[PDB]
Amino acid sequence: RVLGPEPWNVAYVEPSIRPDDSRYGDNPNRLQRHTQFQVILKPDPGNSQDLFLHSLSALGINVREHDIRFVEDNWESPVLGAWGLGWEVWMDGMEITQFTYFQQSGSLPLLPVSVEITYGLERILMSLQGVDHFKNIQYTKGITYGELFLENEKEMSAYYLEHANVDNIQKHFDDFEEEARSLLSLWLPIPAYDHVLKASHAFNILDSRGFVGVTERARYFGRMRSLARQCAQLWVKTRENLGYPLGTYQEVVGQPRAFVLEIGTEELPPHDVIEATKQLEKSLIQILEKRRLSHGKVRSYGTPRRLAVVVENLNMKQMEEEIELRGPPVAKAFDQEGRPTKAAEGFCRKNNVPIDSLYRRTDGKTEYIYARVKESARFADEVLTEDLPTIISGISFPKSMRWNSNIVFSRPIRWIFALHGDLIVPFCFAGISSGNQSCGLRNSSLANFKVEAAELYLHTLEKAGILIDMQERKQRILHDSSILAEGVGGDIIAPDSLVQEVINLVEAPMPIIGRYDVSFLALPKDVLITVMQKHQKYFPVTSKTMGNLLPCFITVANGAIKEEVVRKGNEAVLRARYEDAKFFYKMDTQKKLSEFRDQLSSILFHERLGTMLDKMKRVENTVAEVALLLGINEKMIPAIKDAAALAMSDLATNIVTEFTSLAGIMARHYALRDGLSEQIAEALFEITLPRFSGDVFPKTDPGIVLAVTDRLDSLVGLFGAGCQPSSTNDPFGLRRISYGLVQILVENKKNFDLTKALTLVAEEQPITIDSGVIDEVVQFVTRRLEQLLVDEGINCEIVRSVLIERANCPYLASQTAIEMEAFSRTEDFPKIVEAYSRPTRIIRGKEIGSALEVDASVFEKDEERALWSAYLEVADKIHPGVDIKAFADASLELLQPLEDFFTNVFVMAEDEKVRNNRLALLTKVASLPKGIADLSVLPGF
RNA sequence: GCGAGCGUAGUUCAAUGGUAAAACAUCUCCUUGCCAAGGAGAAGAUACGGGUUCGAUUCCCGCCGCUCGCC
Question: How far apart are CA A732 and CA A586, in angstroms?
């Protein structure tokens, strides 16, 4: 009932049962059956998030005292085929509610869009009551929540988890599927959807029991997606054959003054402020001067809910000067006794100057009749009315919404404040008429004010608390955090990829210190800081003497905050996330690390080639040779192989399934603790480097072998088994995987062979690899090397004349392409590029049959006896792997006997048989540079 | 999967509302001949389709290819 034109304001309460989250009722947060509260509003009323905050203080919360935050989180579900954009609501660190605008459902777009608010009533009641474990929540006066739902939590888990008969469910799945597919032919949507409901249930208690393998999930999701995809198209029609019984949705001259334009919004993401406070100022800078208007210091600003721009002392009229303008040539328009044909009139009509006010000028060919024009001063406030809406509509985001019309933006626009001097610039955009009002800090005494003159805008804004200048929020975060961190004895850890995302989550910052327990310090350091940074957005604190962690953290509130309830509320969320990660860790140190391999066989890699255990199986059997292609020392080929079986073992651990960014850290941590060598453990970490664009590369010796051998397999397998990247679409990430393999080499001084390693790591795969499909992987790698090499300030014509035969070993190519440009800029390049061109053109094909023929059989020539000597004494130096400088000094002395041979000897055949000496003697001199550079492409030939 | 930027002789690049320029390559004519080099001349392009305007390579829409970020 969100599909159609039908208005549907409704709100209900329902439990929700998901069995794979059943944990016998012991961990205080996860339940197999939890109550929700759902409210859907269609159409969107407009107050849709000022009714929410009345709801909160209705259920007894003090919203001027706690810290309510709208942190963005999109929503998508492919099974139903729906998605939407919106936020989640953090009260004092706890995520309590989701808030979404819908845009797809089934597979047909929505009109009008719906608003979905979904409270979760057991994560709210533990916070509002000071309780850590759900079985202490007071249900009513006298009875507890545990004493009602505990054994249902306890023994429905044993059913969904161990004793669920798993074939009388595999049959019921297909039975329900068939019945729902049949009742979609008598045109009955209601039961034909209830059967989809009770089939997608029976799939969950299959998945929980583990009976679903790894390759059946892609089939089950498909089987059940096209049932919801085609119940929708039946419902939306059976509605309209009734006639929609619930209505239908249809719809002056003076000195210069400043000019300020703000576009209020609802909370934008943290990185849609940065890429939208630029393509607005640029798009304004252009159009201010395109229309002949002069100004001064233009300056942008940003906040999660406004995007302001200020242009100072803007003009009051256009510049109003007369400019020349030339039109069509005298050939097209002008003619003898036929001057106005069809073009002269079109050239004067759009300019309305009289037709006898034209003259001629030597415009190249003394043509292009023309005249003058006027600029038409237009008061600088009726100009902007025409050009602002196309400014504001210009900004473009990757993800975008619709709320009440077909206009698209990233979040709904709520107010527009655009003024100039004292007067308002009047226009309208997306149903909002511009004015001079603005909302300050929400839920304050200045939640609505009006600014009179545009020169006291900023001074009024920061009179309501807001700090809009983005670069003066960083300096009030990182400078009131230091006093706190030094009051306890330490200092903060602020990677500037976290400050750029803490700045744009706040409007008027306020920092607070908090304490967590000391007995959590036994965890690894890089799980503490990852909990405190990548999920909660806190600041850790490290004692600057003996620089390890302390039991403190720093959090950033927003506004007029009680700062006695928010510290106490934040201290008790990462007393729970730590308390879960500690249980996971203690469950992971129960077994030696070498046993976590045999769980790997339940992670999919690719369908027709398999899991991850087989892939890591196909690497121990080849990492004993890629250490010979790289020329690794002999006394380390043992110490690599035992660190190759343990590789990628931590990917089945309990932690790494929860914190999927610690793949690689929590393998070295276990390995060192188990009692391996140091270099084994350190190599167990760089099988993952680099993880993205711009990360450290493997430096140790056994760290390169594995990081190369993995990237060879994930290339040859994915290529020779269907998934080729031939598209703009990038599945399986075949671009960065191929890009990193050349950086691990050019950054590490290694000599490799791309056409021998790919003839040996393809031999192993399960599917057959023919010699033709590895000749495209070499090209897909060489193009990536060329792109890496061009954008280092290199010239484009030399990197295509070294990559013809030095393209195999990616280090020597990147070595000899930088060393060739510096030689190309010196004044010996035109001597050599010609010296080698006189004997490669002259031999464009004359049936040289006797292959070698270089002999003194009959060499009765004069200059031959002095040319072949030079060829031998240079060819004795140039070996197939020499550098470019020995070449560039060994050909300069060969260039002279060339012009002493061509001067006299008549190479072409005046005799019948003996004219092949004179041909081979130049074929050889032409072929010497085969292996160093392909000299027949460079210009100047 | 979505966005962003691009497409001009054979290769590299200037221009813009209305006679699309130059470099290297190609061709012909020269002759201390066949190669090279110095000289004159000639031919050669806006990926494709649609829209307004008198005229679009330029402004608008749609299709094809390429490069790059996220998934």
Answer: 34
Distance, CA of A398 to C1' of B5, in Å:
14
Please give the protein residue whose CA is closest to the C1' of the nucleotide B17: A327
DSSP H/E element including A360:
strand A359-361
Query: Is there a contact between A55 and A121 (Cβ–Cβ < 8 Å)?
Result: no
Is A416 within 8 Å of A434 (Cβ atoms)?
yes
Inter-helix orientation angle A701-719/A637-645, to 10°: 60
| Residues after which chain A has a gap (C–N > 2.5 Å) | 251
Q: Which amino acid is at A324?
A: E
| Helix ranges, A675-806 (H) | 678-683, 701-719, 736-746, 754-757, 774-790
A935/A834 Cα distance (integer angstroms)? 10
Handedness of CA A261, A266, A270, A276 (dihedral sign): negative
The Cα–Cα gap between A196 and A198 comes to 6
| Helical ranges in A621-677 per DSSP H | 626-629, 637-645, 654-658, 665-674
> What is the distance between the alpha carbons of residues A295 and A286, in angstroms, rounded to a whole number?
12
Residue A249 vs residues A4, A8, A42: alpha-carbon distances, Å: 9, 11, 10
How far, CA to CA in Å, does A428 sit from each of A211, A230, A386, A390, A727?
59, 40, 11, 11, 42
Technique employed here was: cryo-EM
Q: Tokens 């004292």: give the residue.
A: A422
H or E segment at A138? strand A138-140
Helix A525-534 vs helix A665-674: crossing angle, to nearest 10: 160
Tokens representing A379 are: 């008061």
Which positions of chain B lie under 7 Å from any protein Cβ?
Answer: 1-4, 11-13, 17-19, 24-25, 33-37, 53-55, 66-71
Q: Are A685 and A646 in contact (CB under 8 A)?
A: no
Q: Are A105 and A232 in contact (CB under 8 A)?
A: yes
Q: Which residue is nearest to nucleotide B53 (CA to C1')?
A: A346
